[PDB]
Structures are given as structure tokens and as C-alpha cells.
Amino acid sequence: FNEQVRYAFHGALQDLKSKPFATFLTVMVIAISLTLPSVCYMVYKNVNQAATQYYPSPQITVYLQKTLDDDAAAGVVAQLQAEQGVEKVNYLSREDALGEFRNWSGFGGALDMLEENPLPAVAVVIPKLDFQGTESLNTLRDRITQINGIDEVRMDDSWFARLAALTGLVGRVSAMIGVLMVAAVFLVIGNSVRLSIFARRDSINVQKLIGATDGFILRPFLYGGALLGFSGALLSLILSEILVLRLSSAVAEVAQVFGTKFDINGLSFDECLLLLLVCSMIGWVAAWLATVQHLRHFTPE
Amino acid sequence: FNEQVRYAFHGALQDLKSKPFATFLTVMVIAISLTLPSVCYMVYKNVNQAATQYYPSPQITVYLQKTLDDDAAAGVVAQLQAEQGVEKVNYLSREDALGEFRNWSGFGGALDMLEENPLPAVAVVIPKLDFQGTESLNTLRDRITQINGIDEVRMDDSWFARLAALTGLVGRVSAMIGVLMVAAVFLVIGNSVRLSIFARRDSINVQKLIGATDGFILRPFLYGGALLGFSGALLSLILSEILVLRLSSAVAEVAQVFGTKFDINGLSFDECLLLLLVCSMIGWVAAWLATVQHLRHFTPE
Amino acid sequence: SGSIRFEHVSKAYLGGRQALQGVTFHMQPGEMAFLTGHSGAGKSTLLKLICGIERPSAGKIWFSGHDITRLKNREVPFLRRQIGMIFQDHHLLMDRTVYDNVAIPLIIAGASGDDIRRRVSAALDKVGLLDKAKNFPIQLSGGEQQRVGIARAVVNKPAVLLADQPTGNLDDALSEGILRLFEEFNRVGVTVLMATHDINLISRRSYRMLTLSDGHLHGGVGHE
Amino acid sequence: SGSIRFEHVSKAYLGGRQALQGVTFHMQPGEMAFLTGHSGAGKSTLLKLICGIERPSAGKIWFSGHDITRLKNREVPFLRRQIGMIFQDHHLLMDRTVYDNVAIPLIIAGASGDDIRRRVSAALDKVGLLDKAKNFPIQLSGGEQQRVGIARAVVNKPAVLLADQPTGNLDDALSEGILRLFEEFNRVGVTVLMATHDINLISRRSYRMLTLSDGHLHGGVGHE
Ligand SMILES: CCCCCCCCCCCCCCCC(=O)OC[C@H](COP(=O)(O)O)OC(=O)CCCCCCCCCCCCCCC
Ligand SMILES: CCCCCCCCCCCCCCCC(=O)OC[C@H](COP(=O)(O)O)OC(=O)CCCCCCCCCCCCCCC
Ligand SMILES: Nc1ncnc2c1ncn2[C@@H]1O[C@H](COP(=O)(O)OP(=O)(O)OP(=O)(O)O)[C@@H](O)[C@H]1O
Numbered sequence A, B: 001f002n003e004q005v006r007y008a009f010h011g012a013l014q015d016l017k018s019k020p021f022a023t024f025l026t027v028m029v030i031a032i033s034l035t036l037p038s039v040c041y042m043v044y045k046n047v048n049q050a051a052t053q054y055y056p057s058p059q060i061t062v063y064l065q066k067t068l069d070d071d072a073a074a075g076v077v078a079q080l081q082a083e084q085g086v087e088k089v090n091y092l093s094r095e096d097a098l099g100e101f102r103n104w105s106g107f108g109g110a111l112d113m114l115e116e117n118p119l120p121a122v123a124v125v126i127p128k129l130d131f132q133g134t135e136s137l138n139t140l141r142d143r144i145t146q147i148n149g150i151d152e153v154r155m156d157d158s159w160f161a162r163l164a165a166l167t168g169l170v171g172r173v174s175a176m177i178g179v180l181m182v183a184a185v186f187l188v189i190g191n192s193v194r195l196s197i198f199a200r201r202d203s204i205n206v207q208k209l210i211g212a213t214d215g216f217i218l219r220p221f222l223y224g225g226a227l228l229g230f231s232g233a234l235l236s237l238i239l240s241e242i243l244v245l246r247l248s249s250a251v252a253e254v255a256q257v258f259g260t261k262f263d264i265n266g267l268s269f270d271e272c273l274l275l276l277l278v279c280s281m282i283g284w285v286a287a288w289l290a291t292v293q294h295l296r297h298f299t300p301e
Numbered sequence C, D: 001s002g003s004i005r006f007e008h009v010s011k012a013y014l015g016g017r018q019a020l021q022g023v024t025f026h027m028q029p030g031e032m033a034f035l036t037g038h039s040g041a042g043k044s045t046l047l048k049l050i051c052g053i054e055r056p057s058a059g060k061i062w063f064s065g066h067d068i069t070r071l072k073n074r075e076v077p078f079l080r081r082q083i084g085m086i087f088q089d090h091h092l093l094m095d096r097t098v099y100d101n102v103a104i105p106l107i108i109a110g111a112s113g114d115d116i117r118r119r120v121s122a123a124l125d126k127v128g129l130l131d132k133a134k135n136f137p138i139q140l141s142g143g144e145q146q147r148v149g150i151a152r153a154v155v156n157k158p159a160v161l162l163a164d165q166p167t168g169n170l171d172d173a174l175s176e177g178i179l180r181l182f183e184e185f186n187r188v189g190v191t192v193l194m195a196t197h198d199i200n201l202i203s204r205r206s207y208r209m210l211t212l213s214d215g216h217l218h219g220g221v222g223h224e
């Protein structure tokens, strides 16, 4: 490293060491304001995985013609699987529908006495995520109807629309909440660095009077802001990991009740490095803006 | 007001007016950090009401003997209504049970070929909302079975615990988030006042040397700390009001899809006063702790 | 009374040099004396002990018959209120106007609004800064900033005046004017103890002269 | 060159008093002169104009032949780098040791590590603060803090020395030693401009006497 870089770093580091408790308070404030969005983002990441993997989303529930047998119905299933907006199709025979009918009713007197099965074949179609939209699913059900051997699409478009509205509302609210937490990080880091420099504005004036350039003066303050942003962000990564362990027992308990096993996923290594790098830049810019304002104040004209 | 109060208030107020933008930044930092839990409390308050009002929580089912009729079933319903912990009891006849079976099936029109209705009378009992504990429901269900004319008391069991487990998980996560937001408010206000006073510690030293008592020195700083908390808290109320109006339109569309009408409840007048009063106290205590540190620093021994 | 008495007083800063070694003297009320010595002799330390700013490591200090060697922190504000102190660095409030800097001793005592206006303006007249009332201390030269501190120390008619080089700045003509101002207070009965380096100023007077040399006090004409 | 030239320079502070009016003088390189005047005459303002801390409201200022009347903010740091300036309030870095305060001008010039140690200690010896190197400025007397500023102004062997009451504190015996320090720098060829109120110090020499009165300058023996 350059000789003046080494001098600037030591000078910046000496200020934080000079007053231990006050520096710790500033780092603690930044760390808490960064733990809050980190935990919420972790919740959003984990909840999204579970919903995509465990939520029984509404089914198309294609109904086939009753005259078709299993062989002809399978051909209709193959036609369904060849569609652009279809990911997978599962086939249930007329007897399979009768079996589910018996399970729901619990009484065999509604199916056994008939001379023939009154229930049609049922095909379960897995729609693609991009094609699960309002207009896409509407278009999908038309193409399904156009496919031979299909006379009814049991999908209701009511529960699908009702569930769509709630998803749109939750995304709308979370977006507004997420902005506030991010905007709070910028202000908390920016104001803390701004106020720290203001207490030392005398040393800016003294150095300028003896002929120091602006670049020379800025470097100790720039490295101080970066260290403050880095130290605060680093401490939050410890807090976020600890709060995972507190919730590890709770999530495991819920998964035990449902039987299915689920595990929480913490922050990845890429996100941890990005958080440290971004928080340092915020401190670096905040220190640059604060110091330049003082250098213009001491300018005679 | 006393002469010492007016002088202390005037001196504290003149300091804020000296550097407008610096004071504005500190207020904006506090306002954002208070809007974040203000909105999240409002989200919790409305969701808690809507879930209580609208969510069809799982209920308790009572099955009667097939030999009883509607008149005898009503007597069983009357016995169900008089039990402690019962909110209300609903009754469905044998035809009503078959009618719902026919409606779900669609193709279940062949049931008319049967000589008699195989489904018994069904009664629905809603337990009290505060009495939905796991042990209480089992105790209530067992006590219900003792009522004459009941063939079976049916509970969803698994769906009861699964729904309860998910709600409990939401409680622990929300409580974890709530503590972090509260801690941030304490630290942000406390640290902003602490750094503001530290830049004026030279004026504390001067007044001590000329014989000012500790009470006289404290007063200008105590009023300045309370004003910062009051100004920041007051501004966050405006932000909370604005963000409600943005979300007010969004909830209308969600309610429109469901048809039922719902309205967003803001912060009541009592809550607004409590927020202003609490934040002023935090600034008062923070300004007291910081100033006492400097007073003890400038004493000889 | 306004007497000051020392008894084998010795001060040693934390981890530093022994500023004073066994200083012993007394001053009768209403008398004026000079304090002189080379740089670093400990003149400012001696004045700070009287004001209660520093606590001696040994010996006892009597102020108007009251022992103040181990005063509790609660009673200190009522001791400095009786002392008019002029500091070396002028210790001014940079964010308050010149008028507010001189009026702060009166506010602490709790004088009426009309009385403050009359007394502050009278004090600033004695130092020639009357037109400088509405300026801030950053808008004054070194000589005028020094005179603001002098005016602040004479508003509250203190019983004892402690001057720490009150004419380091200021020309010879203005230095004599300040010296005559102290003599006016001495005639009333105010005890004046002023530390200075101006040997020319001392040569024009015949007051008691105290020499401080390397932390050892010499009484001059006599220790009486 | 190291000459200074003034032509009808007039300075008026923002919304304030008229500090100077029609100041006109010039100084040959290597010439030593004294600046005097009553308090508030404008001696510090005149020194600040030369260094570039303040810009004149009228007239032109020449430094070593260059016109510095309207200097770009980029070029200012390379002007003050050639000027050894001593202030009234000593303008120290209170959070750095005495060694760090004296060594900063060398670091700005980017001197080597070994050369900093030799040159800083030599400078502190000239003012008698060699053993104070590890101390902080808060642990120094009034005259010791003043001598730190003098040491800082002479490490970088500047072309011009501007002193603003360098002996306001300090006794006469020590003040004469400080004056002799400027004498030997002048013999090398450094231009020295000293502002002071000490009549005795001036009377013991025979240098040029620049008298300033109410913002008006008298050349002394002559304007030549
Ligand atoms: C860091 C905290 C992260 C928290 C993440 C919570 C993950 C929840 C995992 C436990 C439940 C998974 C098993 C359930 C699925 C199943 O059993 O199987 C899927 C079941 C149906 O299948 P079965 O009939 O075969 O049982 O679906 C259900 O019973 C209901 C759907 C459950 C989907 C829940 C997903 C959202 C949960 C949100 C809770 C967290 C909210 C946080 C506050 C905003
Ligand atoms: C500050 C902004 C806060 C916004 C809060 C909005 C609350 C919901 C308002 C719209 C709800 C209308 C639903 C009508 C139900 C109905 O009529 O019908 C109720 C139906 C059953 O009755 P029907 O068969 O007769 O329709 O129930 C359902 O279909 C599912 C239950 C819906 C209950 C939703 C309650 C929780 C919603 C939480 C969303 C907000 C999350 C915020 C992020 C955590
Ligand atoms: N706060 C302090 N901490 C430690 N040592 C100190 C402190 N103040 C002064 N000293 C030391 O005590 C001694 C006397 O200092 P003091 O300020 O009393 O001197 P002084 O007689 O007023 O001198 P001067 O002529 O420089 O004003 C010196 O050696 C000085 O370095």
C-alpha cells in the first residue's frame, strides 16, 4: 500500500479506538437497523420456497368424455401434455374417480347399484408458473376444451381469482415495508457518519490552513466511514445467524405436526459479501458528502 | 412559566434553528424509524380483526342417531346450546346432509333410487373463541358426547392442530420482529441525541467553571432532547397517515373481488398521544444520560 | 472575608510533573498582589487550586475561613460563584453573542431582566466593547475576545479576582487601562491576584510580588 | 524570490467593519520587519491576506512575483505550503501528540520516515520542548502550547515567516530567545514579518517598523 494510505488508515483507526463505548454504540445502532431487513428478507426467501413447494395451488381439473375408455383417455392426456402451457398431466380413470367418490361419501349405496359408472375420466394438469396467470390460464382452458375428448374444465376461476387478489395485496404491502427498512439503513448510516465528522470539524480547518490538499484531508475520514459501515454490517451477520437458531426449534416443531420435514435456509455466502460491500459504500459516500461540505465552509470565497 | 424554564427553552430552541438541514436530517432519521413499527402495528391490528371476523375457523361436529327426527334433534341442539363454552349451535337435517352431498357431487342424482336416506342428522357447534385451547376442546367434546341422542362427536383433530401450529409460528416470528423494531427506536433516538450533545460539550465545561449548578446546565439539553423525540414522532404520524391512504385503495380491490366490504383502521387518537408522549420521554432520558457523563468528566475528582 | 491561605500545598498531575512543591502563603482581604515566574512554573495551577478546579495532593487551602481542600462536588458551584476568574484561553461560548457571554453569570445568580441589561452594558463600557454587543465571538480579534472574558468576570462584583495573564494580547496603552480597572475594584475591597509576564507593567506599581520558580513559591518582600 | 507586495489593498468583512483601507507596501526578499498597532487595528487581517486565508475586496497582492489576488481553490494549498504561519490561538490538533502536531507539515510534503524523526526533534529543541513529545496538547501550559505552534512553523524551512504575536505568553527571557530564533532564519534568507505588542523587544533591535492604525498603514522610515 501507499505510504499516505497507511498513514490515513492508522489515523482513522485511532479515532474509533480513542473512545471505545461511543464507537460501540454507533456500531450497535447500525447493526440493529441492518438485522431488521436481513431477518425479513430471510423470512421472505424461506416462505417463498415453502409456498412454491408445499401449497396445493388450484388445479385445472380437466373432465373427459364418459364414452372414452382408458386407452382413448391416455391419448387425450398425451394431447394435453403436448400443449405449450402444460408442464405435466396426471390421468385418473373413471374407476379412480369412483374411488374418490366412495372416500368422500363413505357409503357404497350411491355408486354400486348403478348399471354403469356415471363419473367421467379426470385428468390432473400441472400448469407452468408463467402460464398460471389470469389470462394465460383462461387461454389454457380454451385450448384444453379444443382438445378432443374433453367436455368440461372443472376449474372455477373464482377461488383462483380470490387467491390471486390476496397474493397481489401481500406483495404490495411487503414492497412498501421493504422500502422503509432499506431507506432507514441509508439514513441511519448516513446520519451517524455525518454527526461523527461534525464533532471533528476543527481538525479539518487546521489541516487546511497549513496547506493540505482536499484529497489529503478526505482520506482519514473516508476510511472511517467505510469502517463504520463495515463493522456495523459485520455485527448484524452475527445477529441474523443467532436469530435463525432461535427459530430453528419453532420451525422444526411445526414441520413435525404436519409430518413433512422442512428446514430453514439462512443467508448465502454471496449475500453476506454483498451486504458488507454495500454498507461500506454507503459509509464511504456519507463521509465524502459530509467532509466536502466542511471544506467548502472554510473556503474564504 | 418560570423564568428559568423560558430561558432554557429559548436556548434549546435556538440551537435547532441554527443549522436547519442538520436538524432536519436527524428528525427524518427518527421519523422513518418510527413509521416502520407504526405501519407494522397497523397491519397486525387489521389482520387480527379480519381473521377473527372472516376466517372460517374449523368447528366441532356432532352426529345424531339415525332413528331421531328433526324435533328430537332440536332437543339435542337445545342441550348443546346450554353447555358452557358453546357460542352457538347450528342444525342440518338428514335431507340437508344429503342435499349438500348432492350439491358437491353434481352427478349424485342417483341417490333418489334409495328407499331411505342413509345419512344421519348433523349438528354444528362453534366453541367460544377464547376457549379454543387444545385441552379445552377435547374436554368440551368429551362432555358433549355425554348428551343423549348423539351418535358421534366429530372433530377435524389433525386440521385443528395443523392450523394452530401455523398461527403459533406466526406469533413467534412477529414477536421477534417487534422487539427488533422497538430496540431500533430506542437506539436511534438515544444515539442521535448522544452525538448531538457531544458536539457541544465545550459549552458544558464553560458553565461549570463559572459556577453553574448541575441542574442549570442540564435543563437546555433535556428540553432539546425531548423536542427531537417529539418532532420525530409527530412527523412519523403524518407518514403513517399517508401510507394508509396508498394501501386504502389496494384493499378496496381485494374486498371488491370477495364482494364483502372491509375498511382499514388507522391509529386511534389515544395511540397517537401515547406515541408522542413515549418518544419525548426517550429523548429526555437519553439527553439526561449523555449530559451526566460530561458533567462527571469535567469534575476534578 | 475574602482572604486566601495556603499551607504546604503541593499539586502533581496524573502521571505528570509535580507542578507545585510545598507552596505556603496567605493574603489578607482586599490586598492586591502580582504572580510572576518563568513559563511552566505553575502560575495557572496555583490559580486553579483557589478556584476549586483542581484538588491539591497535599496541604490545606482556606478560602474566607472555610476549608475547601476536600469540598464535595455539590458545594463547588457556590464557591466559584464568589470568584471572578479570567482564563488564559478566554473560555467563551462560541455560539452565543457577546452580550449573552457576559450576562451568563447574572442569569445563574438569577437577576431581573432590566438589571441584567444595565449591568452588562456598563461592564462592556469599561473594556470598550460596547458596540460589539450583538457580534459573535468568532467576529472579534484576539484582543477583543480577551476583553470579553475580562468583562464577564466583573459583572457579578466578585469577592476575589483571579486573573490568568489578562494582558497577553492588547497593546501597552490598553494594558494600563485594564490594570487601572482592577485597582478600582481593589479600592472597594476586592482581593486581586493577577499572574502576568509584563515586567514593564509591574515596574510602574509597588504591589506585593510573588515569584514562582519551578514549583517553589517565594514570598518576595516577606511571607507575612 | 520571497518578496511581498501590496497595492491599494482593502479588506472588508462580510457585513462587518472595514479592516483595511488602501494598504500599500512591498518587502524585499530576506528582509525582517515588525508590525505594530493598537488592538483591533487589523494586524491579523494583514497576515491572513498574504497567506491566502482571506481575499482582498480591492487592490492586488503579489507573492514572489505571482499574482495571488484571485487564486483558484486548487492552487491555494501550494501557496500556503511555502509560508510558515503562527496563529494567535495556536490552532493545534488536540487529539494528537506534540510529535504528531509538529510532524504534519512534513507528512504533507511527503518526507521519509527517518527524516521526520530527525527534523522534528531538532525543531522541538530550538523551543525547549524536547521531552514534551509524547504529551498531548491538553497536558501543556499556555506558553508551552504556544511554542508548539512556533516549532511547527519552522520544520519545513519556509520561504516566508508570518508570526501573529508569537510571544504573547512566555517571559521576557524566553521571548528574546524566540526572537533570536527568527534572527538566524533571517540570516539564511527567510523573509520574516512579525506582529507584536512588546515594546521592549522592538526597542532592542533596529528593524523596519510597520505601524498600522485604524486600518491605515504607515511605512515607518519610508515607503521605499
Ligand atoms: C426464518 C423463518 C422462516 C419461516 C418459514 C416457515 C415455513 C413453514 C414450514 C412449516 C409448514 C410446512 C409443511 C406444511 C405443508 C404440508 O404439510 O403439506 C401440504 C399441506 C397439504 O398436504 P396434506 O393434505 O398431504 O397434508 O398443505 C396445508 O396443509 C396448508 C398449506 C401449508 C403451506 C404453508 C406455507 C406458508 C406458511 C407461512 C408460515 C410462516 C409465516 C411467517 C410470517 C409471515
Ligand atoms: C394496513 C393494510 C392491512 C391490510 C389488511 C387486509 C386484510 C384483508 C382485507 C381483505 C380481506 C377480504 C376477504 C373476504 C373474505 C370473504 O369474504 O370470504 C371468506 C371466505 C369464506 O367465506 P365465503 O365462502 O362466503 O367467501 O374465506 C376465504 O375464502 C379465505 C379466508 C380469507 C381470510 C383472509 C384474512 C387474512 C388476510 C391477510 C391479508 C393481509 C396480509 C398482510 C401481510 C401479512
Ligand atoms: N492538564 C495538565 N495535565 C498535566 N500537566 C499539566 C497540565 N496543565 C499543566 N501541566 C504542567 O504543569 C506545569 C505547570 O503548568 P501551568 O499551566 O500551571 O503553568 P504556567 O505557570 O501557567 O505557565 P505558562 O507561562 O506557560 O502559562 C507544566 O510542566 C505543565 O506542562
Ligand SMILES: Nc1ncnc2c1ncn2[C@@H]1O[C@H](COP(=O)(O)OP(=O)(O)OP(=O)(O)O)[C@@H](O)[C@H]1O
Pocket (backbone or CB within 6 Å): C138, C139, C140, C141, C142, C143, C144, C169, C170, D013, D014, D016, D017, D018, D019, D037, D038, D039, D040, D041, D042, D043, D044, D045, D046
Ligand atoms: N472573522 C471576522 N469577521 C468579522 N470581523 C472581523 C473578523 N476578524 C476580525 N474582524 C474585525 O476586523 C478588525 C481587525 O481585526 P484583526 O483580527 O485583524 O485585528 P488585530 O490587529 O490582529 O488585533 P488584536 O491585537 O486585537 O488581535 C476588528 O474590527 C475586528 O473586529
